[PDB]
């Protein structure tokens, strides 16, 4: 009998405890692993994949649920009009929940790193124009005009020539990691607001549709990192599984 | 093109005549890893049978160690404070009885769903760190890392978390650094029906690998509210005892 | 040496430092772990420009923009099964010119109110071609795929399609709408053959999974202002070296309009989407009588 | 008897879209068709937050 | 695009570990995959025995966690927390 | 090698001998640990006499006794954020001559019955100067400070001031006096701007912490018989490399009379205390539109 | 099954026990520690900082609580008058409770080493005079006159020229460490009494105030060391925290 | 369940069962059940002598 | 979980058992031992007087 | 407060009886003509 003292924590079951348990099957060798393509070895690999961002999360009925994946762009009065706004927080409850970056961010408390938001123009080849996609760092509210918005981190997107630009949301925060921003005290961890403005217009000739659509694809860069794995709250079930 | 881009024979020497003293006096007990690695009561959770506090057999205790004066004054000697914590939960009846009841401690980090009931689906703890332990078992001890998004925990946050105008309705947000609120510590009685024992879960927390930075004045007033330096203004007491006169003791 | 090498990570390229007090490696702790395939890499990104310079598979040639806008699924070219992965002891047949060739399925019409369609593989090629005969005649099947979805529209037309390859695309139902029926999709829905099946709820892909997050899977865009075709070279993915081609679909090809098709009146209203797929490195084993299903 | 399961030495291969609908039946991707909810929260307008 | 082609950047030493986003970190956390009822008067398992078919898709949290992928090879640490439906620890 | 290096003391200069039976270093024991910065060191004591020989910061010069009676906060000179400490990927702007200069705030009058005032930093410099414009325009802010509190009085005047820098000076309330109200201080009390705020209860510093123990923080004395000024060079302290300058005050400058001001009748009764502060190594990141708060 | 005997002390929870506990978060790496100035690595560093000593702990009301931090000095009759006395015990309930040395001493049972008590003169530049600050070693009661006091360890302080002197209270005790002296049996551990006497006077011309103040700052030397950490009793709360 | 607590000189002696001195944030204290074996602790040489 | 069998004698308190117990005071160094004359190191020294 | 935003010095005249305020050469032009009340106020040095 080796002398031994039991500390606090015996006979407890920590669900995330990494321990050695008794094997049920002695000398059981598993089925050999054949090579399966596409193996994932880190969730940040999934976070780096561009995934459709639901900027136009206005419709709710199932008939128009497909309209959430794209937001309209059309000819305007040429006064620097606002096209679309959304918060740049991947873990926030909103546009980013449709993204794999948003869904995987739901399973982690803290995130850090820059974000790729690719805006792809899905109008005609004869549809020309420019958009100012402005990312406002935290502190600046929703810009009233394009002049307010261009003071932040912004890109100018010729969608007449280049059908898809990426707006890199740079990692600009006080903290090294960001918790998930919420409507309250945790808005301290806001990434900011990303707003798309008509830099010139949406110009088409006769025969081309007057309204086009932009598909926002959201992702994260190589410097992205999630921390402190937690239960997700993007989707919740009040009923059991039959 | 710009070029601008141990006493020996104020160290006791300048005041008195001194002898040589071999000071074999260790300073190892005044370190942070000695002064702070002592478990103190930071949380008490009541799970009564008829009371209105937590009558459904579950409780969501927001992690806030400023609820008890001893450890709060200990850690509030500094502002910035980075450590790993040894969290111990001593569950017992309010009469002190050790009853054969099984509990589920669950760490619920911010963003994870706080359980709305005893039989909530958040108790499946597929990603949340959770402890299953009986009261007949010794108190559940878990090692909690330094989980803050900041480089240190911050018992005093001179500022506001959000932007915008800060009215009197948003004045409660002052001093609430979300680098310190780390979700809730959720306790349940594991079962569909109500537990037959009134239960008290006492949280004892010991900080290891402690690093603390900025020493402030201690707390010489009575604590009133958690994460709040508020003091009783009409009953401000001195830092120590008083004297009838200064020429006497 | 004192423990069986029988954990689930044996044979992998990563050394796992672990703790084990038992005879079996699977009893040990999780431990430590001592362009991107998931981002739909192109042929230029995969370093496979030599195999894509002109896409001629079998007696079939597709003329399309190569290399840059041509996607290799999961960064993996299709290949024949190795000796280590294969378990079937009989040597499989590799026709490679009669079955490895572009088959043109159908010409589904894209409308302004169109929802989208899915094709299950190799169920699409089950009952046509020498590939179909080999799939019906052999129990075991293994092949990659070169799906070339084609949708031509004029420069005054607009719209984009998400041409994506969804592996193990299990079809769910509405469950009676109220969710309390436990209904199952019919055989013509699960394995719709060459003519495919229209999506009833493209937002959830008729499976409860969002269409928005489909781009982790090997995907392509047929944004009409930029490209009129989508070439996805798809490897064989399964938990098994081989599988039945008649009762298991390795992947489902989703072709849905994320951006609706729109054009002014006067332009041609018939915008068809043509599905072309070439099996790659096809392998058929376990020969018996031919079975349709 | 509550079964809690922790997977070690994990290898996973093919990432799919997550589950944005409520689960109804085990080993079944069935969803409530008449109550399909969006992947996330909604907005009253797209020019506002 | 690595922050360089969009903005002007400073040098940042990213000592940010990716070890917590691995499968052995995201999935090595025990979750409720099965609950077995052995009541006294109920009709579920009244004879004191139960046969629970191994199917971890019965609870939404772990089912959605593992269903992020199709193919998934792992060894499992199975823990069975037996208790009374009132949570009591009975000598059984 | 078999454990993660993930305790709270990793990267520190002290080796901790410990006991660990687990995969994580933070699970281990507390273990063993295998002039003075807190005593308000002077510039002579810090070895920084070369940077203090004549205090000219920007286009501003203060004339004061140097080196011996000039305090560097916590023995640390202000410095730009290193690559290891910084997390924001955008390169910050460093104006360094338009924002790093002495700003003169106000001229608060010292009375015989005066209680004391506090100034919150950089809230004092939020809405004035190029520093104010940069703080309003940029989300992220990082700077040290060179606070030069000035109080001139004649040789027949007496009194001493505790000029101290209190980091994270959180303001508390009287809680209704009885301590049962849970009141919170208003915005004009927490962030009083350049004109500061008078202490209601200087004994507890309106925070429940004694004024007597304030000298652990970087402090100075304006004992009028000896010195008429207090120069405290203050570094940037935060748990973060950068922070918002509009809703977080890194420190609060306490200027309270420990010894009351007294003089005979005939001497000038207006004894003003002038606050001068120079930001040092200012760093602004996260540029957007200007916001007052 | 390795043979093992459980000793006394199993399943006990010693609050000060240093043990190894199960980590809740596997493979969680914390936020990297940025450099924060002023780091404390030992409480004796805090004990070595001069902190205002409340020698004049006579006033009690909140209006005159600021008068506790300083004690008056004024012109006398030139008879070696007594200015102020206080006990030299940092852990004793009294003048030293306002000191960080006193507060940190409240958390430790035993202390040893010498103490620095800096007396700073806060009168006018024209205020001259000398004070005899005498530290009486234990055994000697409160001195009746300055002649009784000068027999102990004392310093003579010209506050006309040097505005701040430090009286080093040397470590003179029978025991190697001192417990906290109390009014009773534990007065065995008294440090003694520190008394300030008018060595000559407080001399001012016309136009200078007739009463000045001395601010006592108390600290500990490099040889100081605290031992046997214990719960503090300097402040006690009879009410819970809401 | 009992709470042994070492209260060194100067530390507050608890005046009641529910005293705030039982938070033992610095005092060495033992939590142990009677069903557990007797609580054994190693006490050093603590005398100032 | 290292496999382990508890023998007879667990949770017993032998009063003369020489074992290792949990220290109440972490990193507590005692008062240094000054030289005191006449130290006894064996009771047979007392028996020889 | 308006004045301290420019080039300034702070002068303790209690201790140092004479300070010098250096008016630095800050102009658009390399040389300054003599400023006058009119068009030639372009060449102003500023205000002290
Ligand atoms: C399985 C149980 C795990 C328990 C996890 C507990 C997390 C430990 C975090 C402690 C860090 C400080 C928490 C809050 C600090 C303060 O109380 C206030 N927020 C600041 O006044
Ligand atoms: C002594 C107890 C031993 C317990 C053995 C449990 C076997 C573990 C097998 C887990 C592998 C997945 C089981 C079934 C998967 C899914 O629930 C569905 N079949 C697929 O939707």
Automatic annotation (TrEMBL), chains C, F:
Protein localization: Host cytoplasm; Virion
Domain Picornavirus capsid: 63-262
Top-rank taxon: Viruses
Functional summary from the UniProt entry: Component of immature procapsids, which is cleaved into capsid proteins VP4 and VP2 after maturation. Allows the capsid to remain inactive before the maturation step.
Subunit comment: Interacts with capsid protein VP1 and capsid protein VP3 to form heterotrimeric protomers.
Family: Belongs to the picornaviruses polyprotein family.
Name the record gives this protein: Genome polyprotein
Organism in which the protein naturally occurs: Human enterovirus 71
Entire protein: shown range: 12 to 323 of 862
TrEMBL record, chain E:
Tree of life domain: Viruses
Compartments, as annotated in UniProt: Host cytoplasmic vesicle membrane; Host nucleus; Virion
Subunit structure comment from the entry: Capsid protein VP1: Interacts with capsid protein VP0, and capsid protein VP3 to form heterotrimeric protomers. Five protomers subsequently associate to form pentamers which serve as building blocks for the capsid. Interacts with capsid protein VP2, capsid protein VP3 and capsid protein VP4 following cleavage of capsid protein VP0.
Function: Protein 3A: Localizes the viral replication complex to the surface of membranous vesicles. It inhibits host cell endoplasmic reticulum-to-Golgi apparatus transport and causes the disassembly of the Golgi complex, possibly through GBF1 interaction. This would result in depletion of MHC, trail receptors and IFN receptors at the host cell surface. Protease 2A: Cysteine protease that cleaves viral polyprotein and specific host proteins.
Similarity annotation: Belongs to the picornaviruses polyprotein family.
Name of the protein described by the UniProt record: Genome polyprotein
Natural source organism: Human enterovirus 71 (EV71)
Residues of the full protein shown: 623 to 714 of 2193
From TrEMBL, chain J:
Protein name: Genome polyprotein
Domain of life the protein comes from: Viruses
Subunit structure of this chain's protein: Interacts with capsid protein VP1 and capsid protein VP3 to form heterotrimeric protomers.
Residues of the full protein shown: 470 to 517 of 862
Organism of derivation: Human enterovirus 71
Signal peptide segment: none
Role, per record: Lies on the inner surface of the capsid shell. After binding to the host receptor, the capsid undergoes conformational changes. Capsid protein VP4 is released, Capsid protein VP1 N-terminus is externalized, and together, they shape a pore in the host membrane through which the viral genome is translocated into the host cell cytoplasm.
Family recorded in the similarity comment: Belongs to the picornaviruses polyprotein family.
Subcellular compartments: Host cytoplasm; Virion
